[PDB]
Design a protein around this ligand. Structure first.
Ligand SMILES: *[C@H](C)[C@H]1/C(=C/c2[nH]c(/C=C3N=C(/C=C4\NC(=O)C(CC)=C4C)C(C)=C\3CCC(=O)O)c(CCC(=O)O)c2C)NC(=O)[C@@H]1C
Ligand SMILES: *[C@H](C)[C@H]1/C(=C/c2[nH]c(/C=C3N=C(/C=C4\NC(=O)C(CC)=C4C)C(C)=C\3CCC(=O)O)c(CCC(=O)O)c2C)NC(=O)[C@@H]1C
Ligand SMILES: *[C@H](C)[C@H]1/C(=C/c2[nH]c(/C=C3N=C(/C=C4\NC(=O)C(CC)=C4C)C(C)=C\3CCC(=O)O)c(CCC(=O)O)c2C)NC(=O)[C@@H]1C
Ligand SMILES: *[C@H](C)[C@H]1/C(=C/c2[nH]c(/C=C3N=C(/C=C4\NC(=O)C(CC)=C4C)C(C)=C\3CCC(=O)O)c(CCC(=O)O)c2C)NC(=O)[C@@H]1C
Ligand SMILES: *[C@H](C)[C@H]1/C(=C/c2[nH]c(/C=C3N=C(/C=C4\NC(=O)C(CC)=C4C)C(C)=C\3CCC(=O)O)c(CCC(=O)O)c2C)NC(=O)[C@@H]1C
Ligand SMILES: *[C@H](C)[C@H]1/C(=C/c2[nH]c(/C=C3N=C(/C=C4\NC(=O)C(CC)=C4C)C(C)=C\3CCC(=O)O)c(CCC(=O)O)c2C)NC(=O)[C@@H]1C
Ligand SMILES: *[C@H](C)[C@H]1/C(=C/c2[nH]c(/C=C3N=C(/C=C4\NC(=O)C(CC)=C4C)C(C)=C\3CCC(=O)O)c(CCC(=O)O)c2C)NC(=O)[C@@H]1C
Ligand SMILES: *[C@H](C)[C@H]1/C(=C/c2[nH]c(/C=C3N=C(/C=C4\NC(=O)C(CC)=C4C)C(C)=C\3CCC(=O)O)c(CCC(=O)O)c2C)NC(=O)[C@@H]1C
Ligand SMILES: *[C@H](C)[C@H]1/C(=C/c2[nH]c(/C=C3N=C(/C=C4\NC(=O)C(CC)=C4C)C(C)=C\3CCC(=O)O)c(CCC(=O)O)c2C)NC(=O)[C@@H]1C
Lengths: 66, 160, 190, 161, 160, 161, 160, 161, 161, 160
């Protein structure tokens, strides 16, 4: 399956949190292609900015094996 | 393909292929040569299968080729026949693969959404595929027809 | 008169430990977190996974920091072992209940919540319902990515405190996952 | 779940007995029936939407249930009822392939009565719908397959009632 | 069993059985009668297979039947042979099922833990299974032996 | 959970009383026992695997349970039973250090009977295993420690039964 | 208590107590007798500690005992002193326990919320505890005072 | 939840009847009351902290409950009790705007008795606190608003008891 | 991932061409090779533990790596290295059955070089181990199978280096 | 039912029904509708209650389903379950009646003698009824459960 490597930064505008949030704030992650759409939306809704997106696995414009 | 499916299940389990899984692979490789011939037959008869199925579909559904209907007009009728041709090509691919996965990726995922935007009726498309099956069955030998039927049935099931 | 351990009590608090994987963290630190993930999701209350339960590839990614804890948790619901032990034996409504306990640490808030997840299970894969819960806002708020799930007995939805106690404290799994070799009732004594 | 082959195995395993000819005969019986079952399953899958439609037409629709104040009134409830119908059909197909009723007990039958009673869904009407599906299915599958298909449908009906 | 595995995958996906899955079921039902005979053969030869394998194992591993070793003594040696018999019974079950699942639930999950408490050496157990395979192979016809071998190999793989 | 020291404190807190000599004496009693308990705990941890092995040998194995059709038949079930045995041992050790039975009630004892009844695990056999572990533990820990260790084992047994 | 804390950490790890953890328990049991005496001393001097600390607090914060202030009036002043007494009792409990947990459950969780409803200023409460510490320190021997100080400091840290 | 407007609609929907003048009159009645309710709600929200403080002073504090061995003894318990008081106030305000008691039943009232009994929280004292809040609220809202506010407070009290 | 059969299909699908005889011939070629591959895979699975042992003995162990200050020093690192070896073997077996190198690229090869460089794992030694496994595998599988097996092992080696 | 009880007391006294007695009758008739619902609930859950209770009983008493025991064998086990079903039916009748009298006439008089001839152990029968009560209580709401409990308790008392 196609996989996405995503780097994004998210700010906590609603509430101040005592516990360390640094992992949540800046998170380079591998996302399944199917999941990424929803994940991208979630980052946008948070007001976080997605710094970089790359397709880690799979071939672009492949009809099958996707 | 059968092989891809087996590998994927094994990888999820993080194990080497099970004996049972291996046996199914063995059966598939033996079947393959027969499968290739079945696919070849349909490819040769492709043009006629599409034509005959189209006519049957239009008789089955007068509405689709009517001024209201989506299929109506030369351009539109050609597109409807092109779609039938596409599905036939997919079915041939499926027979050689021994699995619906190749068919499924190209044709069955998002099909509802695509046709709804087009406003093409999904049931009519299914009828066309059924029609193609009947034509294809006649040209195929009985055992060959049964194999082909499964793939045809899957398509009909997928769009329903 | 009442005592400190009377209502909620002391114990439930202080048996919840937020766990965050850190890249530079030493292996033993890291493993303890990993073990707890397995512990909550797959209900391994011994609290150390058996080797066959473990997912190595996912763990290697997690130790590398390629994947987040949230992603690793999604993979576990994706995995067969989950499907084997939890989805297959139980009924559709129960499966939902387990999902919320395994993921989100709480009993299903409402019948409506149950319905939505059941619908997903019926119309799409077990995987799809697992994705949904990890994707769901509540999960994100309570654990985001970094935090390993924990039992959390909420209380803000009405009745959930009662339900959550029931699902976490009492309903220890009561079914065998495997169908084979069913136990005969007798031979009680040795 | 369990299947016919595994059911035989499990019975022998509790006894600790090695597989014997009598056991083998039961397994052999299943193997002959198998081919028919596979054909039936494919028929049902292709015609599933229609089967549900026909069965609903026979029992559920044009009825008090669909009329206001009826359990299947409102789009949401209507959709739920047809979803349930689909479940029953899919599971019955699974059971027919398996040759064992256990899967129905493990997934469909367990807790259904209680759920329905709390919801206020009418069990007898649901049973009626299942019986209607059986009749439609019987036609499509053909006679040899129909007998096999019928037992699983009847099993569901008996469980609910 | 093959069928159980297929149904379970379908239920997870919440879909009707795929054509490919159905085909594998068809193949399995055809194979079954042959499989039954293979199982029957091993059952009849069971007593001798266990005996021969035991002797081979004890020759290969003098230590196990030595005062230090777990197998040593009549009671213990009987138990070791009983274990070999158990595994043979499981293998027969597997052949008829066409899948390792029946074998796996009864024998391969928690096996390490059980034997570690007993202090029985796992590698020696594996050798015994290998020994049983060789005896079983000789009695079976070549094609039959290959089928049986897969199940035997799985056991050896599992206990490692 | 609670420990002996906290138990004394809690009793005083509900009264609202400051700690008094009588209370102090109870605390002092615990402090003397403490050193022995720590030594016992270390012994148990080191010999835990063996303790379980010996106890199983005494009660569980060579029995109908292990024979086909018995609860502990199949590797999976056998492994489960020894896992449960380990749990009991670990918790008893915790209780012994604490000097209070409460942790057993909060973690081990709560809902176990009901779980076992649904599973069809035999309670009396489990109790037998716990008693066997106690006997083995008694030897290793030595007499002074054994008395303390025994009470927690007995507490577990009484809860299950 | 120390023991409770150790058990809880072990249970989270799902392991038997570590040697290091066991050593800390050993140290605690040795310390206990000394700890008991420290607690006893403060209990005897309790009445005077509270009185002296109250006076110091009121000197430090004239406002609290002023018509605007919460502490003002005999009823209110008594309640303020009662609160100081409560915290002293908690500190004694802590010393014998060897951990702040007993203190924490009774006094430090929800303290902010309780005082905010009351409208009592949290910093003033902290000053009172600091005052009590100074009085208590004087009566205690230096080493004893250091032990007591830690618990007093925790309280001040918890509520600020 | 349900509100007065929706309650009328739902009753008509089960009948399948189009909205009629009699139904319209009930809706009209609600609309007149609405303006008063909105004003009351704003008053309550602004004075919520004080309302709770006053009510606690009237019933909860300076009592055995707050004294050691009482349910509201310890900071944790005290904080819990005032949190519960806030809940009751917020929900009553919601109910007053809605004009329907149903939301109280759906959220607050359901399972509360059972929760309290397990916790050992005293129901009568809680009811006392609710009644105290009602009295304070009545003053702030003013007479016309007070009557409307009182019924929801009384509903909560009756449910708990 | 992709397999030989699907690769042919994919190439035709992008062209939009129906399957032709030339394409069929490639598929036919694969089908003949298939039987050999299945036999090879079974051999590898059974001897996997030994294959890894032999390969490690040839390259990894009795070396500076295992000695203190070496990358495979400490139990944790040793275990990691043999786990990686197993991965390579399992994936190569998968590739051999598939008849396509793509799976290796998609799962094993992608990002491995970068991971290893950050870790400080020595690539050349790893490559050496892969080559050693190939040699051992070649023996067990036999000559016809060996040629097919070798290409996938070489593919892994080239990717890493 | 209750009303019969009231009439009988009046007839003994040879008087018309007292106002207080009449009031109790009025209360009973109002309560009846609620009682009917409680009975209905148990009737629907009857099959499961019996099954669950049976299993519990057999676990509690291995002996009854043992070669010596009365319950042993399929025929006998069915009869034991039938008996449990009978008692449940009687309990439902009791709830609607509001009195134990209906229960008592059918089930509790001569019960000892009947079971002694059968040789069934009376205490085991009582345990079965207790088991049924627990299952029934869980399905019933708390207040409903209390009402049902009384009738269940009476049965247990009678067979004792
Ligand atoms: C104060 C001297 C300066 C300052 C601080 C400031 N920080 C944020 C937001 C964040 N700060 C952090 C930092 C950390 N989180 C951690 O876990 C750790 C390690 C333990 C650190 C150091 C993070 C992650 C955030 C983002 C979300 C959050 O709230 O934690 C802000 C707010 C930025 C915004 O616009 O939201 C501010 C103001 N800024 C100054 O002006 C000071 C010089
Ligand atoms: C205050 C008037 C009285 C009081 C209350 C009290 N409650 C608790 C604990 C809980 N109370 C609740 C209640 C609710 N949960 C809900 O969802 C709702 C409806 C919106 C209510 C009202 C719950 C569930 C708890 C337990 C969970 C939690 O505390 O988060 C306590 C303390 C118990 C403890 O051990 O913490 C108290 C004191 N008790 C009194 O003395 C007053 C008369
Ligand atoms: C053995 C031949 C050589 C060796 C291996 C080695 N690897 C690691 C650590 C990791 N290796 C990987 C590799 C993979 N993870 C995957 O998911 C896959 C594909 C399926 C591969 C190939 C990863 C990700 C790690 C890092 C995280 C983890 O440990 O899982 C080590 C240990 C380094 C450490 O200190 O963590 C070692 C030793 N090194 C040798 O000495 C051999 C030459
Ligand atoms: C008219 C615009 C289109 C049309 C209508 C049509 N409907 C049916 C059958 C049913 N329609 C409903 C719909 C509802 N039930 C509800 O509760 C609601 C929401 C308030 C709706 C909208 C139902 C339940 C039925 C089932 C029959 C029944 O009354 O129980 C039909 C009959 C279809 C058949 O073959 O049986 C038709 C024709 N169809 C069109 O083509 C128009 C565009
Ligand atoms: C249709 C023939 C009848 C009908 C159906 C109906 N069902 C519900 C609600 C539920 N029904 C089920 C049943 C299942 N869910 C599953 O996943 C399975 C096993 C695969 C079964 C058998 C469940 C659990 C629910 C509750 C949650 C959900 O909706 O998914 C309704 C809705 C009732 C309501 O008021 O919510 C309906 C209408 N009812 C009829 O009128 C027909 C006789
Ligand atoms: C023989 C190849 C090796 C060997 C065997 C051995 N086993 C035991 C004792 C037991 N073995 C089992 C095994 C099973 N129970 C099951 O349910 C299954 C799967 C169906 C198996 C494999 C059990 C349960 C026991 C315990 C006794 C009992 O049956 O109750 C022993 C005796 C050891 C002891 O002290 O108990 C031995 C020797 N050991 C070797 O050395 C051989 C290589
Ligand atoms: C060994 C002396 C006896 C024995 C053990 C046994 N247990 C199971 C299965 C389970 N046991 C438990 C127990 C617990 N779960 C908890 O959460 C706790 C307390 C916190 C305990 C102690 C549970 C829940 C299960 C089910 C799932 C699981 O095993 O994780 C089995 C196997 C039953 C099955 O069918 O899986 C066995 C064998 N049984 C005996 O006969 C011995 C006397
Ligand atoms: C003194 C340093 C400050 C001060 C004290 C003060 N307290 C109150 C009222 C209360 N104090 C408590 C506190 C506790 N309850 C507990 O359980 C514990 C821990 C064991 C504590 C510390 C409580 C519950 C009350 C409420 C009344 C009651 O006890 O029933 C007051 C008066 C309250 C008021 O005016 O409303 C005061 C004055 N206030 C200050 O400003 C001093 C600095
Ligand atoms: C002695 C008690 C037993 C024994 C020893 C034995 N060991 C080996 C080989 C190795 N031992 C290690 C272990 C470690 N490497 C580490 O980094 C650490 C942690 C600091 C340990 C403990 C390793 C790496 C090896 C492999 C070879 C090497 O050292 O480079 C052997 C040889 C293995 C073989 O089978 O050829 C032996 C014999 N064997 C026994 O029977 C004793 C019980």
């Amino acid at each position: 399956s196609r996989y996405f490597k995503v780097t994004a930064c998210i700010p906590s505008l609603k509430r101040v949190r005592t516990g360390r949030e640094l992992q949540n704030t800046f998170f380079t992650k591998l996302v399944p292609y199917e999941n990424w759409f929803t994940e991208q939306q979630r980052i946008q809704k948070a007001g976080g900015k997605v710094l970089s997106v790359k397709l880690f696995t799979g071939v672009q414009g492949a009809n099958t094996g996707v | 393909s059968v092989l891809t499916k087996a590998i994927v299940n094994a990888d999820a389990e993080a194990r080497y292929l099970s004996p049972g899984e291996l046996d199914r692979i063995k059966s598939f490789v033996a079947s393959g040569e027969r499968r290739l011939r079945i696919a070849q037959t349909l490819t040769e008869a492709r043009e006629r299968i599409v034509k005959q199925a189209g006519d049957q579909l239009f008789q089955k559904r007068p509405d689709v080729v009517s001024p209201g209907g989506n299929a109506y007009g030369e351009k539109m009728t050609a597109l409807c026949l092109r779609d039938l041709d596409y599905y036939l090509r997919l079915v041939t691919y499926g027979i050689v693969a021994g699995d619906v996965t190749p068919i499924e990726e190209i044709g069955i995922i998002g099909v509802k959404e695509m046709y709804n935007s087009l406003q093409t009726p999904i049931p009519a498309v299914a009828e066309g595929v059924r029609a193609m099956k009947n034509v294809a069955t006649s040209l195929l030998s009985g055992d060959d027809a049964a194999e082909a039927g499964f793939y045809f049935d899957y398509l009909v099931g997928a769009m329903q | 008169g009442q005592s400190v351990e009377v209502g909620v009590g002391t114990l439930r608090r202080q048996l919840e430990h937020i766990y965050r994987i850190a890249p530079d963290a030493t292996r033993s630190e890291k493993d303890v977190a990993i073990n707890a993930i397995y512990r909550q999701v797959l209900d391994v209350f011994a609290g150390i996974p058996p080797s066959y339960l473990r997912l190595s590839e996912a763990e290697s990614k997690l130790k590398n920091n390629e994947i987040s804890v949230r992603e690793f948790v999604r993979r576990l619901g994706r995995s067969e072992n989950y499907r084997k032990r939890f989805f297959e034996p139980y009924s559709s409504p129960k499966v939902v209940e387990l999902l919320t306990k395994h993921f989100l640490g709480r009993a299903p808030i409402s019948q409506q919540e149950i319905s939505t997840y059941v619908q997903i299970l019926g119309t799409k894969g077990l995987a799809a319902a697992v994705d949904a819960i990890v994707e769901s806002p509540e999960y994100l708020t309570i654990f985001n990515e970094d935090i390993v799930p924990y039992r959390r007995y909420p209380t803000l939805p009405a009745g959930n405190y009662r339900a959550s106690v029931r699902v976490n404290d009492e309903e220890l799994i009561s079914q065998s996952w495997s169908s084979l070799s069913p136990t005969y009732t007798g031979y009680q004594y040795v | 779940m369990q299947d016919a082959i595994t059911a035989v195995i499990n019975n022998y395993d509790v006894q600790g007995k090695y597989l014997d000819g009598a056991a083998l005969d039961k397994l052999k019986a299943y193997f002959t029936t198998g081919a028919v079952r596979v054909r039936a399953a494919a028929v049902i899958s292709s015609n599933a939407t229609t089967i549900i439609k026909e069965a609903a037409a026979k029992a559920l629709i044009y009825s008090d249930l669909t009329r206001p104040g009826g359990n299947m009134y409102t789009t949401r409830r209507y959709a739920a009822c047809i979803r349930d119908m689909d479940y029953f059909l899919r599971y019955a197909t699974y059971a027919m392939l398996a040759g064992d009723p256990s899967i129905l007990d493990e997934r469909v039958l367990n807790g259904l009565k209680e759920t329905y009673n709390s919801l206020g869904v009418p069990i007898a009407a649901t049973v009626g719908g299942i019986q209607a599906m059986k009749e439609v299915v019987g036609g499509l599958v053909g006679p040899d397959a129909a007998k096999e298909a019928s037992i699983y449908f009847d099993y569901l009906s008996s469980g609910l009632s």
